[PDB]
Design goal:
mainly beta; three-stranded antiparallel beta sheet; 39 residues; Peptidyl-prolyl cis-trans isomerase NIMA-interacting 1; Ubiquitin Ligase Nedd4, Chain: W
């Protein structure tokens, strides 16, 4: 899971908004928390 280096990214081909780590280099679908996660 993401956040040191992240962005919420649209799939610029066909499907979904995904969520991204910059410096690992990993695409998932997660808003990582806020303050509490909960999910």
């Amino acid at each position: 899971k993401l956040p040191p280096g992240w962005e919420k990214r649209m799939s610029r081909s066909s499907g979904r908004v995904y969520y991204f780590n910059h410096i690992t280099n990993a695409s998932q679908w997660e808003r990582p928390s806020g303050n509490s996660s909960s999910g």
